[PDB]
Design a protein around this ligand. Structure first.
Ligand SMILES: [Zn+2]
Lengths: 291, 96, 49, 88, 1126, 49
RNA sequence: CUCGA
DNA sequence: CGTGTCAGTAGCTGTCACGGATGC
DNA sequence: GCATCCGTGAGTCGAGG
């Protein structure tokens, strides 16, 4: 295992001297911002405190070096500068973490990347516009490829598409006033909205997304009310009862995304379970009793 | 800025690399002024180092218009571009 | 382990005070461990992913 | 008082550029219906922010020529916008 | 009859067991705790008859423990005495309106005692504005009602544990000495048969190092611990010997870095464990030690400190337990068993309430001031010193402010319905300071413990991540001054039930055996069977002779909570759905009009009155004048009291708290009677829902798996209509370029949008406002140097000069709509104290009238929940023989799985209540109605009945009532003796082939409405740092396509949909704008760019001294619109 | 190393990544998701794209 | 903090 | 600015399985 | 050469504070 570390510095051509720092970089301010509070006071990022304590102790060391202070003060100051940079990069790694006000450990630069709240899992592996969510309600009359979304959800979801059509049919003079019409819900938009969502598939999602059938594509149907109407046969895939569940809606924009929803993700093209091959969209509760 | 580039290389940052990135040293420990909201010079938010708070607005207030695009102000040392640079310009602290 | 005394009554008949009390022991821990068992399930799932 | 990492502090947000993008699209349409002279003068006064004498020096024209071209080109754009229903 | 004490409606109970003890004050936990803290006359008289001699309140106890304050010499002294309160600063409702704190000024008497001059100056010193508790058991911090929650903490004392080692597989033992305050001390026996001790988390020293430091010779140690070989191996393996040697060994491990003096360690080893300054076992902590060790068990509790004798007896208790011993007597002490403790047992698990939690924060605030006192003494002169100069009340008032302002125990009050508030004040929370962390709570702290019987409810607890950590206090339970929970029992003398009732603690209950409440008892008191179901220690249930029963339960419902005791036929519902049934009753929404349930339990009356959301008459009298605004009562003596009605007030959760008078003019009303009832109340009883005609049948798939079908009559007749009120707020501040002003003049806005505003820019009272409408017109000045090039050109091509202000008006959020009912304006110009930098403040109250909609969540009392899937017209509904259509259709499939038959039994009894019954009196009383009271043999239609928990109606009597249901107005009986009835299909006309169960069920409207839960977003705000869309509906954010959702796209192979979601639709700064343009232009969707979040990741790896670079196919590094200089 | 640093033990992976000076060929499902490229699977492979 | 699936 | 008699955290352990570098 | 101890991991989404 020692060779594993030594051979890495030998072949690569980078010096191990990089493990000892002569200068520490400062992350740009917008990534550690200081915001003003509605009470007149200020709230800042913890990284500013860590950088500030490194600056305070490094400037004090420069004074001791200039003053020729006893080696006991200079050495005991250099130790503190070591612990400050250790807290800036990974507070809490060695010993007890630098606590802020209220015995709260300050976040370090490495804390921006760790765990579920880190940069990778929170802002890279998962992130979206053109989406919504509401309560789901059973719709027996719907076909397997159909779903019912509220009119008020579809208007906001298809807002730019509706603005485009409001200005084509000369319901609105310019695209600017076409936006004010959708925001004010002028009665012309409900006739225009029906033309827009025509054969434009949408995606329905219920968390937790355990398997790939946790997200399926449907043909939207403008329905009154404020609840999403879901087909009774896709309830098994979503593991979705109707005791207060909510589902998310995502609108594919590009031609490729709509084609992926129309062909790959359509609920009618996914009747069988990919895990076992046995059907899922089949009579399950009232339907099996009726038959 | 196309989206096809093959490799993503990572390595140890030389102390000389830290200086090659840095647009200036953060000397003072102060942050901003609590009346004018203007950041103090050489502080953790110094506009001479990181960039202007507002677009095309310098610290001392001599250059506030777009016509002076790219001028390094002589009295406060702040460049005049958009505040987008305050998301990418690195600083550094030179250790004793 | 199972209690040496069973719940003889049925929910149609109506449990006694002590029968109901001893029933809640298994009912609550049945819901309690379900939150932990789903955490280890989802953790194993993302390792397999 | 406060730490952004600490809970209870609202995160900073920036509005969307929809209103700005729509105005930019309508200004780009009204700009195309202008003469190459007027278009090359409003794009040097409002898009580049130069002075009146700076545009006069670049285009090799008189001082009042830039003042007059700007004076009409603004009204020409107001004609095209009011014809398309742009709100005053 | 049920509850014939205040003058309530006559609800007839199916009671076979008499109630020996009536329900206590449900608010006593919050009330009695605070009365002791401030030493109210009610607490003092309560402690007077309790037998106490010279009792001391919580504030007096802190002043006596603090007094006196002396320096090192003793030349200066300060003392405090006589705490008293002046009248409250402002009334309760004024604090809610002006966003201040309900408090009363606290006065004390302080004096300076000077030994070197022989003269004392005494005076009155104001300590601080002390937050006061309202009559409803709540505090008001900055205009918001809060509830201080009682905390379950580990009781102080000495505790022993039997742990099993990991590597050697031998049984180990450990001891913990947990004080009420100070340093901790834990002894243990490791796997090497040696004894050690960890002192305040520090390093583990050999147990003899502590003995040698206290002054014990090495010979006396062998004399005391000689019977065990594991202690002989401890003194032998010991490193250092000597009284002045191990004392310095402790010093260098406890306070490192300091010169070790024989007297600097002699000082702290006495102060940290034996001086009352830095160590203290409470009166309960001392008593718990004197019982666990069996010493001083007869001496009056005077020692408030740990002693050296206790440390020795503790080590003696440990060493015997390790080698199998089961009994021990301390030298000079009573005999006591040797065992390990539960720490979950309610005799070792203590509950500290409001007064103690506040007292501890006062004690810490006093100690911070005491240090200021000692410092101000040695600085100022010793002749101009007064109590006013030594006292700095800043850390004291800031200590109580820190508590009420920020504490897991100071909680924003639940105010959905009166029951939710009552339950909140009776909560028992294990979380918080001194308790435990949520990450530090295994499956053992959360489950039901046999000592919770009659103390903490085993049903009412959340089902989320706080399951088991939050419980509700049982009905008859109470808290003793020690902190444990007592529950009443009927003392059985010699197999005879007596009306003498005594409260027993957890361990006191284990020292006896108690009989179940529903025991067959003779009219004299003797048990019918020799063997009866009896509960014994360690959770044992078995039969036992009648001459063995020591006590028995007061009431059947003794073990359940108030909300749980409100579930009829609870004994027929499994614990899972019963938990949801009680938890969802607290989620009921107050309706416009309230109906008391036909099938009740009797608890609804006392639950409503003790909640405090009704209006009860304090003194008997007649009604002089009654209005919708107030009620005036003319007393017998001649005085008048007038009660003001709370009308259309916004609760903490947006519900409508609205009180209505019940009595009329000139009505004689007794004391303690309900003269006006508020939300979720009908004639003084909790009315959490409505009585709906239910049919149990599948109906065309609209009620499929837990969906609900409703009659449109409930919409037409406002049966499930509720009022909701939202609060909107905006302020006008001082900015860098001027000041924001609230004005009707808004740039580039027509006179039509501003038509609903008054001359100030505020919306007028009564105006109906949709989403997007202006509520408060505010403009903020924007600088010229902040203008877009297009915006400056757009300003030039419109000639509108002097518009240096932009629009920042308060608009109505998406999904909001209602009538403006109230406006409140606060102006710095008009003496109103606003925060510094604010010139004006406006609050607008909007009320919406919400009818029941498709998707709103309804539920019953038995955990039967579901959303509304379809609201058919009244003619489509399956209707009975006489044409009356049903109101609600419930799917049958979701009934026998959940094991909640109570809803079926409620439906049967509910119908019998609606129709009435008449038992055949001729030829005697039938054999099924022999146990029923005579008041139940006849019932008029729409009668109210009570089915108490674990008592009440039996299925034999219920089956018999269905057989003699009263006929309708035509004389026809609609439902059969089975309980089913013949229904007609309203859509076709053909009658349904088979009879269907039909009756009346109590349905509640839960606070989960689609009007709030619907949300959608095209574009909107983005987080400044990550450039991703915001979160939450209130911020107009987008949905999160999480990690698991990306796996689904990849599983489908939907590469383009996945890339589109993570780029242009999220955090592509230039891609999202060009997509919006491409849509309004009709062009195609452009190509996705690089996510801004990935740019931030690289810039953060750089700040960690990592050189990250993106290389092209050739190998050259490519930058991202940026460079690097030195 | 980019697919590993986003899974578990972020600092333990980034340390060894900078010492060994590893270069990541951005050709994987997890990597393309982070940088915004089309995943090399389904409709993203060069055969169908 | 508390709650919903 | 000058500083000068005692002058000394809160809080807390009520998580655990598991693997391998660290250490007597 | 091995017992100790350090560091790692521990469901997803949503509402209001
Ligand atoms: Zn300047």
């Amino acid at each position: 295992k020692r060779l594993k570390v030594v051979a890495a510095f030998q072949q690569s051509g980078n010096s191990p001297m990089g493990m000892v720092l002569d200068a520490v970089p400062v992350i740009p301010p917008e990534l550690r911002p200081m915001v003003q509070l509605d009470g007149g006071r200020f709230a800042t990022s913890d990284l500013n405190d860590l950088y500030r304590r490194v600056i305070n102790r490094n400037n004090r060391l420069k004074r001791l070096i200039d003053l020729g202070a006893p080696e006991i003060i200079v050495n005991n100051e250099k130790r503190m500068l070591q612990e400050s940079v250790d807290a800036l990069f990974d507070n809490g790694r060695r010993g007890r973490p630098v606590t802020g006000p209220g015995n709260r450990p300050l976040k370090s630069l490495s804390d921006l990347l760790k765990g579920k709240q880190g940069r990778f899992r929170q802002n890279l592996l998962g992130k979206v516009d053109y989406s919504g969510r509401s309560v789901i309600v059973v719709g027996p009359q719907l076909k397997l490829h159909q779903c019912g979304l509220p009119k008020l959800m579809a208007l906001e979801l298809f807002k730019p598409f509706v603005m485009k059509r409001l200005v084509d049919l000369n319901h609105a003079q310019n695209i600017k006033s076409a936006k004010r019409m959708v925001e004010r819900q002028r009665p012309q938009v409900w006739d225009v909205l029906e033309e827009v969502i025509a054969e434009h598939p949408v995606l329905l999602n219920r968390a937790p997304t355990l398997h790939r059938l946790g997200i399926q594509a449907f043909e939207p149907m403008l329905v009154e009310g404020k609840a999403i109407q879901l087909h009774p046969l896709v309830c098994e895939a979503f593991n979705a009862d109707f005791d207060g569940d909510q589902m998310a809606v995502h609108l594919p924009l590009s031609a490729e995304a709509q084609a992926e929803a129309r062909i790959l993700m359509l609920s009618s093209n996914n009747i069988l379970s990919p895990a076992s091959g046995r059907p899922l969209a089949m009579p399950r509760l009232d339907m099996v009793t009726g038959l | 800025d196309v989206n096809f580039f093959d490799e993503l290389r990572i390595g140890l940052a030389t102390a000389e690399d830290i200086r090659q990135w840095s647009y200036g040293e953060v000397k003072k420990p102060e942050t901003i002024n609590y009346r004018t909201l203007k950041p103090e010079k050489d502080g953790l938010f110094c506009e001479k180092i990181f960039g202007p708070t507002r677009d095309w607005e310098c610290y001392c207030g001599k250059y506030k218009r777009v016509r002076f695009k790219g001028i390094i102000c002589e009295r406060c040392g702040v460049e005049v571009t958009r505040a987008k640079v305050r998301r990418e310009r690195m600083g550094h602290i030179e250790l004793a | 382990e199972f209690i040496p005394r069973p719940v003889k009554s049925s929910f149609r008949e109506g449990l006694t005070v002590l029968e109901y009390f001893i029933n809640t022991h298994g009912a609550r821990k049945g819901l309690a461990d379900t939150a932990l068992r789903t955490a280890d399930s989802g953790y194993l799932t993302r390792r397999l992913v | 008082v406060g730490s952004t990492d600490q809970s209870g502090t609202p995160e900073q947000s920036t509005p969307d550029e929809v209103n700005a993008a729509l105005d930019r699209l309508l200004i780009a349409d009204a700009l195309a219906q202008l003469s190459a002279e007027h278009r090359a003068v409003i794009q040097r006064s409002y898009y580049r922010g130069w002075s009146t004498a700076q545009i006069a020096t670049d285009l090799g024209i008189a001082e009042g020529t830039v003042k007059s071209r700007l004076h009409y080109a603004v009204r020409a754009l107001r004609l095209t916008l009011q014809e398309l229903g742009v709100t005053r | 009859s049920n509850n014939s004490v205040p003058g309530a409606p006559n609800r007839v109970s199916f009671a076979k067991l008499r109630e020996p003890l009536e329900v206590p004050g449900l608010l006593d936990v919050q009330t009695d705790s605070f009365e002791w803290l401030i030493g109210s006359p009610r607490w003092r008289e309560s402690a007077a008859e309790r037998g106490d001699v010279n009792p001391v309140g919580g504030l007096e106890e802190v002043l006596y423990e603090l007094s006196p304050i002396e320096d090192f010499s003793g030349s200066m002294s300060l003392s405090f005495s006589d705490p008293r309160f002046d009248d409250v600063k402002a009334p309760v409702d004024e604090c809610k309106d002006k966003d201040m704190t309900y408090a009363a000024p606290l006065f004390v008497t302080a004096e300076f005692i000077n030994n070197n001059t022989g003269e004392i100056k005494s005076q009155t010193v104001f300590m601080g504005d002390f937050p006061m508790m309202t009559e409803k058991g709540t505090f008001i911090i900055n205009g918001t009602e809060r509830v201080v929650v009682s905390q379950l903490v580990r009781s102080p004392g000495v505790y022993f544990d039997e742990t099993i080692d990991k590597s050697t597989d031998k049984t180990l033992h450990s001891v913990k000495v947990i004080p009420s305050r100070g340093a901790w001390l834990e002894f243990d026996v490791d796997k090497r048969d040696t004894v050690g001790v960890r002192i305040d988390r520090k390093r583990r020293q050999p147990v003899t190092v502590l003995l040698k430091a206290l002054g014990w010779t090495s010979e006396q140690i062998v004399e005391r611990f000689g019977f065990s070989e594991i202690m002989r191996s401890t003194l032998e393996k010991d490193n250092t010997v000597g009284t002045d040697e191990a004392l310095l060994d402790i010093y260098r491990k406890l306070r490192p870095g300091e010169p070790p003096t024989k007297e600097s360690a002699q000082t702290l080893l006495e102060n940290l464990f034996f001086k009352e300054k830095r160590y203290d076992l409470a009166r309960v902590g001392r008593y718990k030690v004197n019982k666990k060790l069996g010493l001083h068990v007869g001496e009056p509790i005077t020692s408030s400190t740990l002693t050296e004798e206790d440390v020795v007896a503790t080590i003696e208790y440990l060493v015997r337990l390790h080698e199998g011993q089961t009994t021990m007597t301390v030298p000079g002490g009573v005999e006591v068993p040797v065992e390990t403790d539960d720490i979950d047992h309610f005799g070792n698990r203590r509950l500290r309430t409001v007064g103690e939690l506040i007292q501890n924060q006062i004690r810490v605030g006093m100690s911070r001031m005491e240090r200021v006192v000692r410092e101000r003494m040695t600085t100022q002169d010793v002749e101009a010193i007064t109590p006013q100069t030594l006292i700095n009340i800043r850390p004291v008032v800031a200590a109580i402010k820190e508590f009420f302002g920020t504490s897991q125990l100071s909680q924003f009050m639940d105010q959905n319905n009166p029951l939710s508030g009552l339950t909140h004040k009776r909560r028992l929370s294990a979380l918080g300071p001194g308790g435990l962390s949520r990450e530090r709570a295994g499956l053992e702290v959360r489950d039901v413990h046999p000592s919770h019987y009659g103390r903490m409810c085993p049903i009412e607890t959340p089902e989320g991540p706080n399951i088991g950590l939050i419980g509700s206090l049982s009905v008859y339970a109470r808290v003793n001054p020690f902190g444990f929970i007592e529950t009443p029992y009927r003392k059985v003398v010699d197999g005879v039930v007596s009306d003498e009732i005594v409260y027993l603690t957890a361990d006191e209950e284990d020292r006896h055996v108690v009989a179940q409440a529903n025991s067959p008892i003779d009219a004299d008191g003797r048990f019918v069977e020799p063997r009866v179901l009896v509960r014994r220690k360690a959770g044992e249930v078995e039969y036992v002779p009648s001459s063995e029963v020591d006590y028995m339960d007061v009431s059947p419902r003794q073990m359940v909570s108030v909300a749980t005791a409100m579930i009829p036929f609870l004994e027929h519902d499994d614990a899972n759905r019963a938990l949801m049934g009680a938890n969802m009753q607290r989620q009921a929404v107050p309706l416009v009009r309230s109906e008391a349930p036909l099938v009740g339990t009797g608890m609804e009356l006392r639950a409503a009155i003790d909640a405090g959301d009704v209006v009860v008459a304090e003194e008997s009298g007649v009604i002089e004048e009654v209005s919708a605004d107030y009620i005036t009562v003319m007393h017998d003596n001649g005085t008048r009291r007038t009660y003001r009605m709370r009308k259309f007030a916004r609760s903490n959760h947006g519900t409508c708290a609205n009180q209505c008078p019940i009595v009329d003019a000139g009505d004689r009303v007794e004391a303690g009677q309900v003269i006006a009832d508020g939300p979720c109340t009908d004639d003084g009883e909790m009315a959490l829902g409505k009585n709906l005609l239910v049919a149990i049948m599948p109906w065309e798939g609209h009620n499929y798996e837990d969906a609900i079908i409703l009659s449109n009559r409930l919409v037409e007749e406002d049966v499930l209509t509720s009022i909701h009120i939202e609060e909107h707020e905006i302020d006008a501040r001082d900015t860098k370029l001027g000041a924001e002003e609230i004005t009707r003049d808004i740039p580039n806005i027509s006179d039509e949008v501003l038509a609903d505003l008054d001359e100030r820019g505020i919306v007028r009272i009564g105006a109906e406002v949709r989403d997007g409408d202006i509520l408060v017109g505010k403009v903020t000045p924007k600088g010229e140097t902040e203008l877009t090039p297009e915006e400056r050109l757009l300003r030039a091509i419109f000639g509108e000069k002097a518009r240096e202000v932009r629009d920042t008006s308060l608009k109505v959020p998406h999904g909001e709509s209602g009538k403006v009912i109230g406006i409140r304006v606060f102006s710095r110009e008009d003496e109103d104290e606003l925060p510094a930098g604010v010139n004006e403040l406006v609050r607008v109250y909007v009320a919406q009238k919400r009818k029941i909609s498709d998707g709103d969540k309804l539920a019953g009392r038995h955990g039967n929940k579901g959303v509304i899937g379809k609201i058919l017209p009244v003619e489509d509904m399956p209707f009975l023989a006489d044409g009356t259509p049903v109101d609600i259709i419930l799917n049958t499939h979701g009934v026998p799985r959940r094991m909640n038959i109570g809803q079926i039994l409620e439906t049967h009894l509910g119908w019998c209540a609606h129709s009435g019954w008449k038992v055949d009196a001729a030829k005697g009383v039938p054999d099924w109605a022999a146990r029923l009271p005579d008041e139940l043999l006849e019932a008029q239609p729409n009668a109210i009945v009570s089915t108490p928990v674990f008592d009440g109606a039996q299925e034999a009597e219920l089956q018999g009532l269905l057989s003699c249901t009263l006929p309708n107005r035509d004389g026809d009986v609609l439902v059969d003796a089975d309980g089913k009835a013949m229904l007609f299909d309203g859509r076709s006309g053909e009658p349904f082939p088979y009879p269907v169960t039909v009756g009346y069920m109590y349905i509640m409207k839960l606070h989960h409405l689609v009007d709030d839960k619907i949300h959608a977003r095209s574009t909107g705000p983005y987080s400044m740092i990550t450039q991703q869309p915001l979160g939450g509906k209130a911020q107009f954010g987008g949905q999160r396509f999480g990690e698991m959702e990306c796996w689904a796209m990849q599983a489908y192979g939907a590469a383009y949909t996945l890339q589109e979601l993570l780029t242009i639709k999220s955090d592509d700064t230039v891609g999202r704008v060009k997509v919006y343009e491409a849509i309004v232009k009709g062009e195609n969707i452009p190509e996705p760019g690089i996510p801004e979040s990935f740019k931030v990741l690289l810039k953060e790896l750089q700040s960690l001294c990592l050189n990250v670079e993106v290389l092209s196919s050739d190998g050259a590094a490519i930058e991202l619109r940026e460079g690097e200089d030195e | 190393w980019l697919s590993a640093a986003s899974f578990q033990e972020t600092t333990r992976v980034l340390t060894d990544a900078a010492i060994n000076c590893r270069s990541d060929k951005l050709n994987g499902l997890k990597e393309n998701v982070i940088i915004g490229k089309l995943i090399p699977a389904g409709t993203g492979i060069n055969r169908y794209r």
